[PDB]
């Protein structure tokens, strides 16, 4: 049962549609909120936006970083001066199950593999009902941030797994995501210890603490990697997140933006408060016609189960290579002002992933990239065929929120410009 946002404020002109896609036998209720290109939906690609968590709603990217609408105290919509769908029809799915607005009576989803598994089951039901996005030869891609840096590849395989498919995937976008923990994990000390733009935030004492605490942390990532057992992956998580994330947290700096400060407990980004506010409202909860009673951003439970399952420490970075091997154009982009999923570490994981153009990628030199729109160096490229690593200058964990001009700049140009920067 689905309604149109035709009822809510949000994005007028274009033509939005929202609601649910259901799965009988499994009893799973997917929730989405689509928007048609501000230009031509017929030409313009298709996009799957994915937030992390794990267990966080995707609406958040919608009203907070790259959607059309925004949240004012007023709990009144706002137009985005640099929206994502400006030149493309976007999809705002609420995965996993029981996230944001989706739901179920009895499931699972205590891991990634099985999540994609449901995601593909929805991509085929959606494409079905709105076949108006393929036939025309409409390039479809997927994007996400943070934990989606786990999800994405895994979902990307899942999908490509079916030759059976009712659709085509063209590329992947991953922003400030967790992908190859084993490698990204050493980038914790460097980035907080004064080596990645902003300056040292931790007493050198604390720094050496991270450097001792490292060896141990890592052998744990390995064991998880090679074993994939709860017995190793679980302590690898707790231990590493301990030794390396907490010291920064103590300082009470924002975790998504080293420049901004945020003390422990409250929000780092309060405005998202208004968001959970606008969502639950009586009129707003109506339109969408969502069958949920109370909407939360994230679901503690889901988070917990992923954590208690080993999740976070599994080498999903492997999937990346297959996809590259299967000639899939990939884009790894990083806000350079974020601590939780640094550009230092996302840089490096890239710099070492194996794939056919393995040596050439590592050869190719870094170049300064010019924002499509604003005409200003906005980051730093490393490109090689369908695999590109970009460093977004003056960016936090949610790059679109911080630099909208540049994001879209980086966006369309990748969406359009021929899978290169
Ligand atoms: C998308 O939208 C605008 C506006 O009507 C258009 O000028 C632009 O050429 C479009 N696509 C790109 C990537 O240039
Ligand atoms: C994907 O588009 C349609 C979907 O089912 C299919 O007919 C076509 O063969 C696929 N594209 C290829 C050739 O990669
Ligand atoms: C990046 O371009 C060159 C890199 O070799 C450098 O001279 C320059 O400082 C950079 N561009 C800027 C910051 O205008």
From Swiss-Prot:
Shown residues within the full chain: 112 to 532 of 532
MF terms (GO), sorted A to Z: serine-type carboxypeptidase activity
Active site: 146, 338, 397
Its job: Vacuolar serine-type carboxypeptidase involved in degradation of small peptides. Digests preferentially peptides containing an aliphatic or hydrophobic residue in P1' position, as well as methionine, leucine or phenylalanine in P1 position of ester substrate. Also plays a role in breakdown of the autophagic body and the autophagosome-dependent protein synthesis. Plays a key role in phytochelatin (PC) synthesis from glutathione (GSH) by cleaving the Gly from GSH and form the PC-peptides of the structure (gamma-Glu-Cys)2-Gly.
Activity as a function of temperature: Optimum temperature is 30 degrees Celsius.
Disulfide bonds: 56-298, 193-207, 217-240, 224-233, 262-268
Modification after translation: Enters the endoplasmic reticulum as an inactive zymogen and is modified by four N-linked core oligosaccharides, giving rise to a precursor known as P1 (67 kDa). As P1 transits through the Golgi, extension of its core oligosaccharides leads to the Golgi-modified P2 precursor (69 kDa). P2 is sorted away from secretory proteins at or beyond a late Golgi compartment and is subsequently delivered to the vacuole via a prevacuolar endosome-like compartment.
Example of a GO biological process term: macroautophagy
Residues where substrate binds: 341, 398
Protein's name in the database: Carboxypeptidase Y
pH dependence: Optimum pH is 6.5. Active from pH 4.5 to pH 8.5.
Family per similarity comment: Belongs to the peptidase S10 family.
Compartment list: Vacuole lumen
One GO CC term, this protein: endoplasmic reticulum
Note: Present with 44000 molecules/cell in log phase SD medium.
Regulation of activity: Inhibited by ZPCK.
Catalytic reactions on record: Release of a C-terminal amino acid with broad specificity
Keyword terms, alphabetized: Carboxypeptidase, Disulfide bond, Glycoprotein, Hydrolase, Protease, Signal, Vacuole, Zymogen
Result of knocking out the encoding gene: Leads to vacuolar defects as well as defects in the terminal steps of autophagy, when ATG42 is also deleted. The PCR1/ATG42 double deletion also abrogates the production of phytochelatin and the degradation of glutathione-S-conjugates.
Residue positions the entry lists as glycosylated: 13, 87, 168, 368
Species in which this protein is naturally found: Saccharomyces cerevisiae (strain ATCC 204508 / S288c)
EC number, as in UniProt: 3.4.16.5
């Amino acid at each position: 049962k689905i309604k149109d946002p035709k009822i809510l404020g949000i994005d007028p002109n274009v033509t939005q549609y929202t609601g649910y896609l259901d799965v009988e036998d499994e009893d799973k209720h997917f929730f989405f909120w689509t928007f048609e290109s501000r230009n031509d939906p017929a030409k313009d690609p298709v996009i799957l936006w994915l937030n992390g968590g794990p267990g966080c709603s995707s609406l958040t990217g919608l009203f907070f970083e790259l959607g059309p609408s925004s949240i004012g105290p007023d709990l009144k919509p706002i137009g985005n001066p640099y929206s994502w769908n400006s030149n493309a029809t976007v999809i705002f799915l609420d995965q996993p199950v029981n996230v944001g607005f989706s739901y179920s009576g009895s499931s699972g989803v205590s891991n990634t593999v099985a999540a994609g598994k449901d995601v593909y089951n929805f991509l085929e039901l959606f494409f079905d009902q709105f076949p108006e996005y393929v036939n025309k030869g409409q390039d479809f891609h997927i994007a996400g941030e943070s934990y989606a840096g786990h999800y994405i590849p895994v979902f990307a395989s899942e999908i490509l797994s079916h030759k059976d498919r009712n659709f085509n995937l063209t590329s992947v976008l991953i922003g400030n995501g967790l992908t190859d923990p084993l490698t990204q994990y050493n980038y914790y000390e460097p980035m907080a210890c004064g080596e990645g733009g902003e300056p040292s935030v931790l007493p050198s004492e604390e720094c050496s603490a991270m450097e001792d605490s490292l060896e141990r942390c890592l052998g744990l990532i390995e064991s998880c990697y090679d074993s994939q057992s709860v017995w190793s992956c679980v302590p690898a998580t707790i231990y590493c997140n301990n030794a390396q994330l907490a010291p920064y947290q103590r300082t009470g700096r924002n975790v998504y933006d080293i420049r901004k400060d945020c003390e422990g407990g409250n929000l780092c980004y309060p405005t998202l408060q208004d968001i959970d506010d606008y969502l639950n409202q009586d009129y707003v909860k109506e339109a969408v016609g969502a069958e949920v009673d109370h909407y939360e951003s994230c679901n503690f439970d889901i988070n917990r189960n992923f954590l208690f399952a080993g999740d976070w420490m599994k080498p999903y970075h492997t999937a990346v290579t297959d996809l590259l091997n299967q000639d899939l154009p990939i884009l790894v982009y990083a806000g350079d002002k974020d601590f939780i999923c640094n550009w230092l570490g996302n840089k490096a994981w890239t710099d070492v992933l194996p794939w056919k153009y393995d040596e050439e990628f590592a050869s190719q030199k870094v170049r300064n990239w010019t924002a499509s729109i604003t005409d200003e160096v906005a980051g730093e490229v490393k490109s090689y065929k369908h695999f590109t690593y970009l460093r977004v200058f003056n960016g936090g964990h949610m790059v679109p929120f911080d630099v909208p001009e540049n994001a879209l700049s980086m966006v369309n140009e990748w969406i359009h410009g021929g899978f290169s920067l």
